[PDB]
Amino acid sequence: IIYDDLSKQAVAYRQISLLLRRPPGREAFPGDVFYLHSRLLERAARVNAEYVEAFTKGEVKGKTGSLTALPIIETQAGDVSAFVPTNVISITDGQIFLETNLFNAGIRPAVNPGISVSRVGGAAQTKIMKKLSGGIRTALAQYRELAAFSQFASDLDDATRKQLDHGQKVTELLKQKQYAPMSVAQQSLVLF
Amino acid sequence: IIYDDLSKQAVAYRQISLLLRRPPGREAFPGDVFYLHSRLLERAARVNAEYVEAFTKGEVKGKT
Amino acid sequence: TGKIVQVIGAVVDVEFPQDAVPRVYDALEVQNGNERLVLEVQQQLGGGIVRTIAMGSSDGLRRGLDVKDLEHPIEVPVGKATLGRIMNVLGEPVDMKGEIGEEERWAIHRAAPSYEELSNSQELLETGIKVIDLMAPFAKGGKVGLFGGAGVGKTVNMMELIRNIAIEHSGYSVFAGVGERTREGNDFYHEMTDSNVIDKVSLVYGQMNEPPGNRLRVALTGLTMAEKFRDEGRDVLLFVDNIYRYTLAGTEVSALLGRMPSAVGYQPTLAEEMGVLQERITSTKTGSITSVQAVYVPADDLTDPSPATTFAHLDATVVLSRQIASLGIYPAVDPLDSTSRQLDPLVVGQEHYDTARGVQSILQRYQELKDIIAILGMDELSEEDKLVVARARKIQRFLSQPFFVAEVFTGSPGKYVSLKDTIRGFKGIMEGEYDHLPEQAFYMVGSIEEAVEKAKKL
Amino acid sequence: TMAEKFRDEGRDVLLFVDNIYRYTLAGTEVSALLGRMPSAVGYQPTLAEEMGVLQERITSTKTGSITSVQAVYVPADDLTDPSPATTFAHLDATVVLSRQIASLGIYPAVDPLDSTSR
Amino acid sequence: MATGKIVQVIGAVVDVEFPQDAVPRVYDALEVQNGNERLVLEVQQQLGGGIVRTIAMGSSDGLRRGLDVKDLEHPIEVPVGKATLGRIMNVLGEPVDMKGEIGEEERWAIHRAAPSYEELSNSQELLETGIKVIDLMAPFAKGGKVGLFGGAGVGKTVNMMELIRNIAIEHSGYSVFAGVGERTREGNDFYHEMTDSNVIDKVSLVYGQMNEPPGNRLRVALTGLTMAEKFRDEGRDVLLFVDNIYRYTLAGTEVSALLGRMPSAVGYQPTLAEEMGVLQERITSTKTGSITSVQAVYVPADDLTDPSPATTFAHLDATVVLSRQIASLGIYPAVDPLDSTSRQLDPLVVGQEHYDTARGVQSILQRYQELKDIIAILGMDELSEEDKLVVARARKIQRFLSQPFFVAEVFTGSPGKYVSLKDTIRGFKGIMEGEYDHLPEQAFYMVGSIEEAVEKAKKL
Amino acid sequence: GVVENLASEQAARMVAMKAATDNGGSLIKELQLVYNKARQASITQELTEIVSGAA
Ligand SMILES: Nc1ncnc2c1ncn2[C@@H]1O[C@H](COP(=O)(O)OP(=O)(O)O)[C@@H](O)[C@H]1O
Ligand SMILES: Nc1ncnc2c1ncn2[C@@H]1O[C@H](COP(=O)(O)OP(=O)(O)O)[C@@H](O)[C@H]1O
Ligand SMILES: [Mg+2]
């Protein structure tokens, strides 16, 4: 399930609250907006096979059910410190951060690898991708640590110039066109 | 006509508005702080000769 | 059959018999001195009271006056008869000609077209403007918005678009002036009437002098005239001079209507007031409306709730900026913020798309260096990054263009640049084939030819 | 309460609180619902008093002892908004974890130069 | 006979209910017996139903409900005139020093209207303070406002004492010092620093300090001002010192919050500009006399845009900023010639010779300020010879801006000097026109006129 | 020639760093105006939210 702009649902609920004259909060949002998004997002769950059997009254045996949520939030000017983003960032199991500087510089998709997290991590990857992505993480980590010098690249020793030039290349490798999905074999091949 | 400070008119209107408990907006100025200056400055106009005739009951012809 | 019981600013409260209370959005009538004042009810308070907004000067109203309940909403002349004439928010003729010989009148409050009826169009529309139709091309039947602060060119750009697409266009056109200068309305009316195109344009004008209710409903009054031509099977052009005033008028009245303020003093119903309008200005299977909307952003803050909630309602968004206009670079479009739904390889071709994305990349790379250039000077930049800066500046200047409606300011004659002719010039500047030419060769020229020609004179 | 019951038997329990930040958010929500006038950054007025009512029962008495380990999310890494700002007054040690270290692969990801203890 | 009764008490805000036709008018004073001592309440608002809302000019603890309130039919009235010189008084004009009663004969209300349009002086004079730096780089208009943006440890109190002395001696004017909202320690040691320099008989002190309820800190400035106005009506030229106008703003903010009025620009009262204006618009030069004012200003958060400094600077004519540096070099007074400003420095008001002399010395010093950095980094002899002359003249000018005060004799031992304006203009034209290049810079230091710098160089 | 080029290198780095110090100084005086503007806006928005939320 994909919730497009839970940050417009928050605005509709703010309107409803302010018209019923309920006590306003921060940015005029009501108090129970965290309880509005929380009991929505805690429905996206994976259920064990015994719950599915009990629910379907024995019609379906030995199969787990699952529902995945991808709520979308819009931040004004990159301010993660607003009432709605600071709640949904705390409710969810991860955060994909899309940045406008990367989008403008040609890096599409524009995910920020260093500020995005998935708390499930390697458990949700095929073992080939779990094996291969470990080196991408560290390549981009060292590249983000050295990036400051990219403006003084000529001064650097060649022992780090190689790390910086490998980081730039793995960064250029993660760019991808729209409506062009890769099967897991192709992603693993390219990351290898 | 010269309005010596339409910045101090805005401040005096902000005072009068806040003393009446009217919800303020940006920089604590009221909502209609634009309308305040709008209905004022929109009077500085140039009018065609027909307006001058109709207004002055025909005493003044052709001038603007 | 009703009495006034309160007069707070622009809002009036009226008491009716319990069994005759008007409905929401019905129109009432009073006698304010010699004149007749039309009220539009907004709320049904309890006990027969009803709270309304005055479509006129509220001064002179006593308590206890007798108001008459007209049993229909506000209704405006509509159709072919309203063509080439100026009208109030109330549909009354405001030029000194006679009556509007209308055959039909429509209520200005209407439901948006059903999702089933919508239509989508990839047919590109071409304008004589380099930056607009390189960075943010827009298509027939789509929404366009010019975002900018105060005094940056978002009215001059709209008049240029009127010139370039509206005169070369068959169908009728509708121009709604919402809360802008009466001077500009007079100037536009006379420019039209002097070129005999007035008989294709319908004008509605609730300019900045008028009380909040006129500015509040004039936009709807214009959309109705537009919807009519749309449903007749035609295709229409709808120009709205400043849609920000439509919500500013709502903010001015909200607190008097007894509604708790919201984010920055805005009405609690900002997003719904804005959607309920912009959802009915659309093209459909039975006709299409092509609309250009100027959108003022207060205090140049592109994150204020009013522009932030408007961004979502437009297909092509052009963002003007003061930091460019202060460089003399007109139009002051900000190429790193303008976008269009129509900028896809499929829609505009691989060559156009690639040139646009290359320009964006170069300008952004130049932005990233602007602080190191500020602190350490330009001589510290690598030779590769000193080429990027010079090409970025050449591109900055080549996006400038002279307009036919701006001859009054600069004296230079305007230019009309075809798309084929501009993607070529930018491919050239980027690829380097013009990398030996002084920057000022690119300031205010139509096509790359004119720049290589201007370089001979320095 | 469960930890205090175990303490009163003479045991040395260890109490784990999975996030102080959400304890403060629950306090903020509950306070906004009751209509109390808000404080510095929307936080209830009684923020520091709720934090003290919690933290002042975790102590080693002469009969037993309750130790505590408490996770505390720092929103936007600012360390200065009232929740971590008000929790520091009670802690006896602070272990700071950095995502940069974790990304280089070395879990537990503790920063040794910013960690401290009284 | 008392007629009202206290009905509410909330902090410093007290509500009393009168008979329906005896409601006091705004700013009228009331009094109550707060136990064994009376307490004065000032009316701020009239609510409906005979209820009136007041602020207590004293600690409100101990007030019951239902206490009788007597309605004085006039605003707060204070003693004025010659009798108040050398005394110390609080907001209500009560002798706060222990030397007994004030022997005045006449009492004025503190709430008053500014001089009408056709009372103001139809001229524009200047005030000869007697200090070289001020008279040259930041002249005072007679009846204008002067901000004093110096910090601490720079001599603000001794500058104030020198102005008091000179304006009492070399003119025939008195002075009034209003202590709005500052430390008691400074008030006591100012009282002493003045009593041991014989200027105490030339100044009238009124003190409302940080340890006072908000009403006192609010109205003390009006008390000082309404004594200065009595001195004006006698035809004198008067000088009024305010210890901190920023605290006069903040006391009004506190009071406005107490009354529950909606906040405004950045936390301030909605009536900020009017509260500041109705004060600053009473110190002007009238056809009979004039009140000049020297006001210490404190800028919050180092921001000259904050509403309080922005509202104050609308009224200041001059501005003298004291500098720790200029003191460190040993030059006293410690005024900074490059940051001190005055809107009296125009040829059309001060004349062309004074204007261009001041602009000269300004350009000389502001070049020297960077030639000295070039020296600091590259060493002296890297300079050009033209620049060495610039440095050699700038050092002399910089020394000549010192002066010995009659008040500073107890530190310098040298007798104090009062330098007329003509003499400062002559000295600086000479030093800048290339005259006196033949005598050493220490011949100018702490001298006085240039005709004394020549004599000091003679014997050196 | 090598030694003279070295002395010129030092004399050029000196003026470059002087200009960079002056440009940083002239940039603080802009960042602080932006900072004060944001401080005032935050105070105003918070205090207005509280007051106009109550009652
Ligand atoms: N192409 C252009 N050439 C010259 N000046 C221009 C051009 N476009 C805009 N301007 C300038 O833009 C200024 C602002 O005008 P306008 O667009 O009406 O402001 P606003 O954005 O409020 O409508 C004009 O005075 C004009 O000089
Ligand atoms: N004209 C002067 N002559 C000699 N010394 C002075 C003069 N002005 C100030 N000083 C010295 O500067 C010091 C600052 O003292 P003070 O005026 O009490 O501080 P502040 O002015 O900050 O209250 C004094 O100790 C005094 O000795
Ligand atoms: Mg315009």
CB C248 within 8 A of CB C179: yes
* D and A make contact (3+ CB pairs below 8 Å): yes
Residue E81: left if φ>0, alpha if ψ -120 to 50, beta else—which one? left
Task: Say whether E182 is catalytic.
Answer: yes
Q: Which ligand is nearest to the CA of C402?
A: 1
Q: Is residue C234 exposed (0-12), middle (13-18) or buried (19+ Cβ within 10 Å)?
A: middle
Distance CA C193, CA C83 (A): 12
Q: What stretch(es) of chain C map to CATH 1.10.1140.10?
A: 343-458
Return the closest-CA partner of residue A7 out of A118, A67, A85.
A85
Burial (0-12, 13-18, 19+ Cβ within 10 Å), C18:
exposed
Q: Which residue from B23, B34, B42 is facing C182, i.e. has the nearest CB? A: B42
For domain E345-460, which CATH number applies: 2.40.160.210, 3.40.50.1970, 1.10.1140.10, 3.40.50.720?
1.10.1140.10
User: Encoding tokens for residue C390?
Assistant: 């010079």
Beta bridge partners of E177: E205, E241
Indicate which of C254, C260, C367 best probes the interface with A, i.e. most A CBs within 10 Å of its own CB: C260
Q: What is the CATH number of domain C343-458?
A: 1.10.1140.10
Burial E7-42 (b: 16+ CB within 10 A, else e): bebeebbbbbbbeeeebbeeebbbbbebeeeebbbb
Helix (H, G, I), strand (E, B) or coil at E106: strand
Q: Which chains touch E (3 or more CB pairs under 8 A)?
A: B, F
A 10 A CB-CB count for F47 gives 17
Cβ–Cβ under 8 Å, residues E334 and E128: no
Q: Identify the CA nearest to E237 among candidates E179, E169, E316.
A: E169
**Domain C1-73, CATH among 3.30.420.40, 3.40.50.300, 3.30.70.260, 2.40.10.170:** 2.40.10.170
Please state, in angstroms and rounded to a whole number, the distance separating the CA atoms of residues E344 and E124.
10
Rounding to the nearest 10 degrees, give the CA dihedral for residues C172, C178, C184, C188. Answer: 10
Task: Tell me, in angstroms, the distance from the centre of ligand 3 to residue C154's CA.
Answer: 6
Alpha-carbon distance of A95 to A86, in angstroms, equals 12
Chain E partners within 8 Å of F40 (Cβ)? 265-266, 303, 305-306
Pocket test for ligand 2, best of E411, E417, E445 (most atoms within 8 A of CB): E411
Would you list the DSSP string of A81-142?
-SHHHHHHHHHSSEEPPB-HHHHHTT-SS-B-TTT-EESSGGGGS-HHHHHHHHHHHHHHHH
Span from the CA of C154 to the centroid of ligand 1 (angstroms): 7
Two tokens at E246? Answer: 């920023």
Helix axes E214-233, E245-258, angle to 10 degrees: 130
A101, exposed or middle or buried, with CB in 10 Å at 0-12, 13-18, 19+? middle
Tell me the Cα Rg of chain D: 17
Asked if residues E25 and E71 have their Cβ atoms less than 8 Å apart, the reply is no
Q: What are phi and psi of C250, to 5 degrees?
A: -75, -40
SS3 for E158-219 is HHHHHHHHHHHHCCCCCEEEEEECCCHHHHHHHHHHHHCCCCHHHEEEEEECCCCCHHHHHH
A191 neighbors A122 (Cβ within 8 angstroms): no
CATH architecture entry for E1-75: Beta Barrel (2.40)
Q: Which of E265, E270, E273 sits opposite B19 (nearest CB)?
A: E270
Q: In this complex, which chains have at least 3 CB pairs below 8 Å with chain F?
A: A, B, C, D, E
Helix, strand or coil for residue E417? coil
Render D28-53 in DSSP notation, one character per residue. HHHHHHTTPPP-TTS--TTHHHHHHH
User: CA C446, C449, C450 angle in degrees (round to 5)?
Assistant: 50
- Extract the tokens encoding B1: 């006509």
- Chain C positions touching B42 (Cβ under 8 A) are 181-182, 207-209
**Which of C300, C218, C220, C305 minimizes the C-alpha distance to C270?**
C305
- List the beta strands (DSSP E) in E34-174: 38-46, 51-56, 68-71, 77-80, 88-89, 106-109, 126-127, 140-141, 145-148
Q: Decide if F48 and C265 are in contact by the 8 Å CB cutoff.
A: yes
Chain F interface mutation, best of B17, B18, B22, B26, highest count of F Cβ atoms under 10 Å: B26
Q: Is C40 within 8 Å of C55 (Cβ atoms)?
A: yes
Closest by Cα among C13, C3, C18, C5 to C258 = C13
Give ∠ CA E349-E350-E351 in degrees, rounded to 5.
Answer: 100
Around ligand 1, the residues with Cβ closer than 6 Å are C 148, 150-156, 330-331, 403, 406, 409-410
Contact E117, E232 (CB under 8 A): no
Measured between CA atoms, the residue of chain B closest to residue C10 is: B32
Chains within contact range of chain A (3+ C-beta pairs < 8 Å): C, D, F
Smallest-distance ligand from the CA of E192: 2
Ligand 3 centroid to residue C151 C-alpha, Å? 7
In chain E, CATH 1.10.1140.10 covers: 345-460
Contact yes or no for F20 and C377 at CB 8 A: yes
Hey, which residues does D66 pair with through a beta bridge?
Answer: D13
Q: What residue type is assigned to position C433 of the chain?
A: E
B59, two tokens = 């005493």
Q: What is the CA radius of gyration of chain E?
A: 25
Instruction: Tell me which residue has tokens 């920057």.
Output: C439
CATH topology of domain E76-344: Rossmann fold (3.40.50)
The residue whose CA has the least distance to atom 19 of ligand 2 is E153
Tokens of C452: 């290589």
CATH 3.40.50.300 positions along chain E are 76-344
- Whether residue C307 has a cis bond before it, omega within 30° of 0: no
Q: Would the CA dihedral through A43, A46, A51, A57 be positive or negative?
A: positive
User: Å resolution of this model?
Assistant: 3.3
Token pair 């045991």 is found at: D11
Nearest to C375 among F20, F45, F52 (CB): F20
Domain with CATH 2.40.10.170 in chain E: 1-75
Greatest distance between any 2 Cα atoms in chain D: 47
> Is the minimum distance from the CB of E185 to ligand 2 under 6 angstroms?
no
**CB contact at 8 A, B54 and B34:** no
CA distance linking residue A110 with residue E77, whole number of Å: 73
| CA E409 – CA B9 distance, rounded (Å) | 51
- CATH 2.40.10.170 intervals, chain C: 1-73
CATH topology of domain C74-342: Rossmann fold (3.40.50)
**Tokens standing for A181?**
């999905």
- Enter the tokens of residue C383: 């030779």
Ramachandran region of residue D117, left (φ > 0), alpha (ψ -120 to 50) or beta? beta
* Distance between A140 CA and the closest CA of chain D, angstroms: 9
Rounded to whole angstroms, the Cα distance separating C235 from C48 reads 45
Q: Closest ligand to E413 CA?
A: 2
Residue nearest to atom 17 of ligand 1 (CA): C153
Q: Is-contact E296 E156, C-beta < 8 A?
A: yes
Q: Which of E17, E182, E193, E212 is catalytic?
A: E182
**C355 Cβ contact list (under 8 Å, min separation 6):** C134, C423, C426, C427, C430
Atom of ligand 2 nearest to the CA of E150: 22
> Contacts of residue F48 in chain E, CB cutoff 8 Å?
263
DSSP assigned state of C320: B
Nearest by Cα to A87 from B60, D42, E94: D42
Q: Which of F17, F49, F51 to probe by mutation at the C interface, max C CB count within 10 Å?
A: F49
The structure tokens listed for D85 are: 């700002």
Please state, in angstroms and rounded to a whole number, the distance separating the CA atoms of residues A98 and E364.
Answer: 56
Q: Which of E8, E40, E45 is nearest to E26 (CA)?
A: E45
For residues E336 and E138, the answer to whether their CB atoms sit within 8 Å is no
Check residue C349 and give left, alpha or beta (phi > 0: left; psi -120 to 50: alpha).
left
Contact D33 A138 (CB under 8 A): no
